């Protein structure tokens, strides 16, 4: 009854959101310029949400046929925008492509649909700049694995209406996912800045020798990143004294302490690089094979997290 969603680029954030979508009941169309990523993505989404229902992993109360039943292939762009109310793109990270296909879907577009950009760091003001359905535009960057990462982060054009953003976190919220505002662009949005604030200091302590990366990588798993799966880290200082007031009377001055000791941003040399790759590869080495090994751990994990969050 409502327009369905479609996904520009059948690739892996498109297949995901495919999934998610059909988990919420909508009727799903996957666009992508080569016909033949259509096909695999149809294929590959078939496969996984078997492996899904196996491992009790599925979302929702559809069943596997229900949910494939309503996501279809459509070729051609035209015929897949009209009446859509919703269309999440995932063509590679490249301004310019980004904006040539928002050009040309400007040009075909009705004055309902929302456009949304699965990008993880091009800004809202060059992706929509000069666009006449600007008003429908914003980013919705999710996390890979979406299926098992809840965050969306939702970033909005300076002209992007408030209804886009009230429908578009709406929206999100029917198919499971937990999206949250940005209400200004910056570099990285939110989640990248938090994640390079970290890396920047991991790669100086690692290039230092206070601890080896294999360690550094403990200090979080079995620390830090405990309490990070259930609470940030604004709450956390709550909770670790009497109130928020309390921690920054008792700590704030050893964090400036603290921060005043920081080297300078690093260069992230190849020869830092290769050294850091060097003491990752002990434990993961770098082929295929290993990668992909330690990767279905991981997301086996995540899974296993997000079922856990979910009882909670
Ligand atoms: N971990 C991730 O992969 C991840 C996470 C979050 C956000 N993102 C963002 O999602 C977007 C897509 O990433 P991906 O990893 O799924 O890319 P991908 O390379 O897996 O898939 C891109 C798809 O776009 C198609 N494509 C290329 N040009 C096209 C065009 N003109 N029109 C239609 N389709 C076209 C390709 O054929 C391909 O199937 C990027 O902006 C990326 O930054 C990726
Ligand atoms: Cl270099």
Not at 287 to 308: F, G, I, N, S, Y
Request: proline share 5%; net charge negative.
């Amino acid at each position: 009854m409502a327009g369905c969603v479609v996904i520009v680029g059948s690739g892996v954030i498109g297949r995901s959101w495919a999934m998610l979508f059909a988990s919420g009941g909508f009727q799903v169309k996957l666009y992508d310029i080569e016909q033949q990523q259509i096909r695999n993505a149809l294929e590959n989404i078939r496969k996984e949400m078997k492996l899904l229902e196996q491992a009790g992993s599925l979302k929702g109360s559809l069943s596997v046929e229900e949910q494939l039943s309503l996501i279809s292939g459509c070729p051609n762009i035209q015929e897949a925008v009209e009446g859509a109310m919703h269309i999440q793109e995932c063509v590679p990270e490249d301004l310019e492509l980004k904006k040539k296909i928002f050009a040309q879907l400007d040009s075909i577009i009705d004055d309902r649909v929302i456009l949304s950009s699965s990008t993880s760091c091009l800004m809202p003001s060059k992706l929509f700049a000069g666009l006449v359905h600007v008003k429908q535009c914003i980013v919705a960057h999710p996390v890979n694995p979406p299926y098992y990462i809840p965050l969306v982060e939702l970033v909005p054009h300076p002209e992007t209406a408030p209804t886009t953003v009230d429908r578009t976190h709406a929206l999100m919220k029917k198919i499971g996912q937990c999206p949250m505002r940005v209400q200004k662009e910056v570099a990285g949005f939110v989640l990248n800045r938090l994640q390079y604030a970290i890396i920047s200091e991991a790669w100086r302590l690692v290039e230092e020798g206070i601890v080896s990366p294999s360690d550094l990588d403990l200090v979080m798993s079995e620390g830090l990143g405990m309490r990070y799966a259930f609470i940030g880290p604004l709450e956390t200082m709550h909770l670790n004294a009497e109130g928020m007031l309390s921690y920054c009377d008792r700590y704030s001055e050893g964090i400036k302490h603290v921060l005043q000791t920081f080297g300078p941003i690093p260069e992230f040399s190849r020869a830092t690089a290769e050294k850091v790759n060097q003491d990752m590869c002990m434990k993961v080495p770098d082929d295929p094979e290993h990668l992909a090994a330690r990767r279905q751990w991981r997301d086996e994990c995540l899974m296993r997290l997000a079922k856990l969050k979910s009882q909670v």
